Amino acid sequence: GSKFKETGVITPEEFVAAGDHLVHHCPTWQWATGEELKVKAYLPTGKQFLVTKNVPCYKRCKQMEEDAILQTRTYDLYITYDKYYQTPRLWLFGYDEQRQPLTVEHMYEDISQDHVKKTVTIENHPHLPPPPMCSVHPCRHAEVMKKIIETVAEGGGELGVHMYLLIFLKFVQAVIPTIEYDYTRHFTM
Template identity: 30%
Template sequence: MQALQSHYWAVRDYLSPVLKESKFKEHGRITPEEFVAAGDFLAYKFPVWTWEKGDASKGRDYLPPDKQYLVTRGVPCLRRATSLAYTDADEDAERLLSFGDSSGPGDEADEWVETHAGRKPHGDSAANPGDIEDIPDLDGEADNVASGIGGLSLGPTGAVEETPDLDDIPDMDEDDLEEKDEATAPTKPSGLVDTSNIEVAKGNLLQVRTYDVMITYDKYYQTPRVWLIGYDENGKPLTPPQIFQDISADHAHKTVTIEQFIHSASLQAASVHPCKHASVMKKVIERMNNSVVEEQLSRRKSGGAAANSKETKKKWPFARKTSGSGKDDRSAPGEEDEIEGMRVDFYLVVFLKFIASIVPTIEVDSTTSF
């Protein structure tokens, strides 16, 4: 079934025409050229992102051969999304995707994206009826969608912990292979995580997983698409149920599935299905664009001070982007003097913020941590 669907998508992808004209402000979709431009911008500003050429046989001819998709490796994931402890107000502020005050058109189909909106008093998310703070306290399977499903697939597939695997080679501990070396730093505390220094939130075990995150261009939906490959704290690849632990419960198994990575002949990766990306991006961009235009106007009029206060209130992201640091108000007016609204270069930066709401614990949005 899965394979059939994948093939269907592949054919549909092949048949659909390449988007030619730029419409990203109208409906949130971008052309391959804009994807490349936005990718160039992202890779330039945040060198953790790089272009990859991928498998030659899977190349897309509407993209430059050496710029088929973007990748960033080793993205840390400190906690499980299923165990998120909602204590930090700052984290809230970093999410740019609360539509609380702009729900005029009220497109109900878009509500699924507001994973964090439920935390606010004015949260309007019908999909999040329960107080989200309760989730970590509830015991286990029944209410916790992701871990429930994870548990389900753990049973029949037998994809259990790694330890049983090692029973296959029980006599391979060769501790006498080399003598003890005083100059080797102890691995457990230092090589991985200094767990002693970290407060473990609400009894949830802290593990540092890392993810390789890829962004491809989806021709059918004309939006970027995100793919994830995870590793546990020992560098072992994560199983699908483990990956779903890092995806907010609203999305695991609904919009996130394990699929064939489109730029490789054999690789499987978790992917966020892009069917809703365009409409969400359109909303975000509309909002961003308004504030960008406003910002630019007010900057032109009054300069730094006014813009600054607005920025702190709205947490407008691009002020930081343009110069790479928080203090850009001096340099920015010179850079973007003309009022043009949001440029398409920012598309992927915005897109990452959106993705960050789907995978809240994967620090994919490096644009805030710098």
């Protein structure tokens, strides 16, 4: 009784189970362990969070010259489990062309400013080392989430919570619609 559609809550076993499907559907997703010493007892070391990287973007998500942009970089995604909220979580960390980390303010350029303030936040990884990366806050605004969740009701995708990560990524695209990463890119509907 995940109730992911009713209340939007999943168990750690289901969450970790979901990654198997995500990685299978797209090889870009990989289960990662993170720091061995920071591993969770109730969470399998072999599978603590998903991650996909080296995903470039062709443009930013702001308002500049019609041909301003002219630089390509890469971003890194991560997917952890929040026991408190009991739902899938996603981080966000990028780098410049010189293989150097971007400042928090610069990182925001490739994200909706109206969202970075509330919809998103900056936090340190619970099992990964510094510097700090951007962490999304699920359940914040159920109004927009109801749309992404409503996807399951579309009538395609069975009632398997193992696909929650794929449904979740679609939501994230709305926070980073300028990054061309793999996540089904909408199916049918």
